[PDB]
Amino acid sequence: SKISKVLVANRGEIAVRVIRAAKDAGLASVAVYAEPDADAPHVRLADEAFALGGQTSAESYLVFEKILDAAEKSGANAIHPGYGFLSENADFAQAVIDAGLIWIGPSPQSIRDLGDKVTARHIAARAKAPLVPGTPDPVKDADEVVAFAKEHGVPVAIKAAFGGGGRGMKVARTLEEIPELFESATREAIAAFGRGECFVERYLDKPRHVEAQVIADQHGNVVVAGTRDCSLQRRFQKLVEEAPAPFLTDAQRKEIHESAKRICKEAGYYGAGTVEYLVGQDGLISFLEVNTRLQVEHPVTEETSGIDLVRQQFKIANGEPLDITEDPTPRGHSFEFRINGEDAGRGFLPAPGPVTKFVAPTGPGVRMDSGVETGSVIGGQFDSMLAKLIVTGATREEALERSRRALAEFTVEGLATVIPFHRAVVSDPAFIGDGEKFDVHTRWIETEWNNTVEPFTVPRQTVVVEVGGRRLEVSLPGDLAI
Template identity: 60%
Template sequence: ESEAFARAVIDAGLAWIGPRPETIAKLGDKVEARKIALKVGAPLVAGTPNPVRDAGEVLAFAEQHGLPIIIKAAFGGGGRGMKIAWRMDEVEELYHSAVREAVTAFGRGECFVEQFLDRPRHIEAQVLADTHGNVVVLGTRDCSLQRRNQKLVEEAPAPFISEGQRERIHSAARAICAEAGYVSAGTVEFLLSTSGAISFLEVNTRLQVEHPVTEQTTGVDLVMEQLRVADGLALSITETPKPLGHCIEFRINAEDVGRGFLPTPGPVACFEAPSGPGVRVDSGVHSGSVVPGTFDSLMAKLIVSGATREQALARARRALREFRIEGVASVLPFHRAVIEHSDFVGEQGFKVHTRWIESDFAEPLAAALRAEPQPDTSLVRTAIEIDGRRVQLGLPAMLLQGLAGASVATTQAAGSAQAVDPDAVLSPIAGNLHAWKVEDGAEVKEGDVIAVMEAMKMEMQVTAHRSGRIALAAQAGTAQALGAVIAHIR
């Protein structure tokens, strides 16, 4: 979603597949997108008309409209640069945190503020538009199952909404894209409150991760349509198609569900995807791949279709059981649990919302076991120089039993002491120690926020696991390995 990149492609004389650069700029600015939504009469909650200049303006908005409020990066997306304030005393810190995340992820820190709809569903409309004036809404998707405002499960068509709500979303999406002069594939996102109220969220000026569920339920190849539009042709369809069954997509991320969905970069020892009727897997890794810690944690997408939602769920259960990933933690245990949960299955009504994982999902999930590399104790290795070349020399440990034994014993004892040290504050992720929130030697209480970590362009708070006096063991701005000791509380 880069206006500059799109313009550079066009200026180079190449074919740009996507919306016009000026449209990307217009809709990528969420404040401007809100103005378009207001102009066409799309449903919308109260918000600031322009980016706020400081935390004081955020506080003023909260005092006028009440809490909770949401602070959002004006040029962001994907949950980054987005903070929810429930109390006045946390507004200032959350505002600065949102700005930092926005600058890190998008290069710009402008933020605006909206009223926050508590426990809403996330419903979006897939749109296609061509240069001949055709704007078609292919259908809806439900993307309510999220953690940290980033989607985990998506399905199409959006279940458990009325035809009136579906038509309201379709018409608003169509009007917004027409007013913006949109071309190519795009997604218009909305929130659906528990009272049934609908509010425009944003427009994603690209093909989204979850686009396969729309492809599976409409029979429309979205990439092919993008190519047709870029070639100056009209869309192959001109009206919303009738859904062809139901489809559910599960994002397979390298995250440890037992540790709060913390990213777990590293090597993938084994990657075995399922197959069978209705099962599609789009993957970016294989056995032997390495998941880096500097980018998104998505490894693959499991896309399961059926004639009905019930059949899609049954096929998904089997596929999730067959999926095997080793070497890095994954969200597979969560998916296997959620697909059996009554709130998601919907026998007594669909009860999932965008904060459902944090507030309602109570099923305990074990942290992933981490295989630690075992040192080769049969050899003692040392670096030596032979004929001007530096080489590694390995000597049998038995030849140096006295010295090697003492060294190994000391190392093992130190490692064991660290592993069971009740005072140690461990880094919950592999990432950057962005900032300390307490001074060295300060008294802290259990649950206090003591530090902020950053990984994959997301900020995460580190809290005190006990009360006492804290001794900092790592400097702000340094990279930390998962499980590294960053402080002690005694």
């Protein structure tokens, strides 16, 4: 009933992070890699490594059978999904539990309930969380959305009740847009999310995206590790994040630290997770989502609050009660920059290519969580995030100064990266607030920011063997000379 060996069913930065956490805790670690990742750092860093085969995620990382076979062969008794892939797949969580393994994460029931944004809104209502006006049930047709628009006032937002990635949002500005927008939304929800259910709500104009990291026990104890801000986004996905959330009033930090606890406790959530809210220009907090997995931006919370969230996940999965009894007090400010392989000068477009040079900065208050190294090759089969640079300081201004230094030092060559955008934004006055507020928002990058970034410029042999009662495959380099 206690974790002994952990299989990390993911890749890259998160795989390295979880492997390091296992090493710190004294647990054995098992990494799994697809064909493109035979040289990935996590493969060599993990105590054991297993090849899942396949050339893409649909063939390697998203196959329950492959992941569970790797776990069985390795003898690992726990599975940690990181984030993405199967981290929020209730079916996979149930499969992991059935196989007799320790699922490091929330329960399948919690995942399933909080993944249905309709059920999520119902739980938020039961928990009395702040809510943006919207339909409590999926809209039957575009006529219902038209009626809602007439009732509340445009603009309006349409979202698939299932799935995510940011692309599920559609926006209507006038009463004439709804028919075609709703038809497109239904088609896209059917095609790309597997379920055509869609719902409607009020669209905030220039909101700030605010989250609260929650460490939830199996025994009912819940602690909010700290708030966080992720307002800087493109295509509804984050690029730069902060901790603690800056420029919130005390009345706002409260009601968030409490809505998170109430929503988690009402949903019965246990394990690490986050409660994403929205803060509009008027200053009204609104519940948006609950992520039922370790979130990418956990490093900033770790730096500010001093908690190790992956080890906390291990302790929650073991079932021990939380050692943290009260919400930690942040000791400083921390920024996190995602080093994505995208060309900011070309509309943040992915650019696969080789990492001919990757010199991470080091020094005071600099932390680097990278899944690549000099010599790595980046393809289009997976997300384009190469690393995460965390800069911490005693105050927000000191953190910004240290970020200007660290970003100047950080060097990457061979493919495009958002490093220039980070260097620009860290110095942009809109992001360097006047001292009590700042002007960025969930669409500032694409709409206001002055984009001055100049555009960037043998098969293995296999043998099938049988030893005793098992069938094995021995894979060797094609040019094995022996």
